[PDB]
Amino acid sequence: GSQKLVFFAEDVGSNKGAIIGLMVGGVVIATVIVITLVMLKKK
Amino acid sequence: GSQKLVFFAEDVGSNKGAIIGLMVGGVVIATVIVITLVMLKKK
């Protein structure tokens, strides 16, 4: 559920990258496109 | 240790939504802004 999910990282450590990278990349990329659009429409 | 860790989800069940909602919302919102920008610059 929580702690156990972490244990998997100790044995594998090749899964957390997918989940984290998904939430992180999405939020980052998302904002990137937003700021770019605002600046484009700004001027 | 294992099973118990899962039980926590049955009691709360308000955590998985954060992770999933983060990856899902990020990917969705991200694309949304992208398509909107392409259309705005298109015309």
Curated annotation (Swiss-Prot), chains A, B:
The transmembrane helix undergoes a conformation change and unravels partially when bound to PSEN1, facilitating cleavage by PSEN1. The basolateral sorting signal (BaSS) is required for sorting of membrane proteins to the basolateral surface of epithelial cells. Changing residue 34 to I: In AD1; increased amyloid-beta protein 42/40 ratio. The record marks 23 as: Susceptible to oxidation. The record marks 4-5, 7-8, 28-31, 37-38 as: Cleavage. Induction: Increased levels during neuronal differentiation. Chelation of metal ions, notably copper, iron and zinc, can induce histidine-bridging between amyloid-beta molecules resulting in amyloid-beta-metal aggregates. The affinity for copper is much higher than for other transient metals and is increased under acidic conditions. Extracellular zinc-binding increases binding of heparin to APP and inhibits collagen-binding. It is linked to Alzheimer disease 1: A form of Alzheimer disease, a neurodegenerative disorder characterized by progressive dementia, loss of cognitive abilities, and deposition of fibrillar amyloid proteins as intraneuronal neurofibrillary tangles, extracellular amyloid plaques and vascular amyloid deposits. The major constituents of these plaques are neurotoxic amyloid-beta protein 40 and amyloid-beta protein 42, that are produced by the proteolysis of the transmembrane APP protein. Cerebral amyloid angiopathy, APP-related: A hereditary localized amyloidosis due to amyloid-beta A4 peptide(s) deposition in the cerebral vessels. The principal clinical characteristics are recurrent cerebral and cerebellar hemorrhages, recurrent strokes, cerebral ischemia, cerebral infarction, and progressive mental deterioration. Patients develop cerebral hemorrhage because of the severe cerebral amyloid angiopathy. Parenchymal amyloid deposits are rare and largely in the form of pre-amyloid lesions or diffuse plaque-like structures. Changing residue 12 to C: Causes formation of an artifactual disulfide bond with PSEN1. The lineage of its organism: Eukaryota, Metazoa, Chordata, Craniata, Vertebrata. Proteolytically processed under normal cellular conditions. Cleavage either by alpha-secretase, beta-secretase or theta-secretase leads to generation and extracellular release of soluble APP peptides, S-APP-alpha and S-APP-beta, and the retention of corresponding membrane-anchored C-terminal fragments, C80, C83 and C99. Subsequent processing of C80 and C83 by gamma-secretase yields P3 peptides. This is the major secretory pathway and is non-amyloidogenic. Proteolytically cleaved by caspases during neuronal apoptosis. Coiled coil: none annotated. This is Amyloid-beta precursor protein. The gene is APP. It is found in: Cell membrane; Membrane; Perikaryon; Cell projection, Growth cone. It comes from the Eukaryota. Belongs to the APP family. The chain holds residues 686 to 726 of 770 of the full protein. Residues 12-39 are annotated as: Interaction with PSEN1. Binds, via its C-terminus, to the PID domain of several cytoplasmic proteins, including APBB family members, the APBA family, MAPK8IP1, SHC1 and, NUMB and DAB1. Binding to DAB1 inhibits its serine phosphorylation. Interacts (via NPXY motif) with DAB2 (via PID domain); the interaction is impaired by tyrosine phosphorylation of the NPXY motif. Also interacts with GPCR-like protein BPP, APPBP1, IB1, KNS2 (via its TPR domains), APPBP2 (via BaSS) and DDB1. In vitro, it binds MAPT via the MT-binding domains. Associates with microtubules in the presence of ATP and in a kinesin-dependent manner.
